[PDB]
Amino acid sequence: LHKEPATLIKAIDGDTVKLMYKGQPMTFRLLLVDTPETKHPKKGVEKYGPEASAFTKKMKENAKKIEVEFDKGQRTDKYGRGLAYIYADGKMVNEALVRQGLAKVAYVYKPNNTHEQHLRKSEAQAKKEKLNIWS
């Protein structure tokens, strides 16, 4: 796997962002995580939804460098969103959210699970500390 630069266009929510990738505006969906929904009516504004978005937003807006890291499988989901591990100044946003109890490790679709254990460990740590989602 390798990191590729991307430029923030707009953070949509905690796990979905619009990035300029290879001079192309693209919506990216954070691999292996699920931040609470703030959009979809069928889900409603979920607890920590807002917090997860602010977090991603903040992390990404304050970053000097944004990098996208595709996994070994599909790079896009059925919605056409790029599936990556996104890094803000070398910090994986996916993990950052999980570690904070702002996302749960979800949608682990092999073989796009390269950092699953990593994220799982951070999630365990967040549950362990009863952070946000786990509080």
Ligand SMILES: Cc1cn([C@H]2C[C@H](OP(=O)(O)O)[C@@H](COP(=O)(O)O)O2)c(=O)[nH]c1=O
């Ligand atoms: C993270 C991720 C989401 N998705 C799909 C699973 C869900 O489809 P459905 O929308 O049909 O439930 C949806 C979850 O994304 P969101 O959390 O943005 O809703 O996106 C993938 O297909 N692959 C992935 O790796």
Ligand SMILES: [Ca+2]
């Ligand atoms: Ca989500």
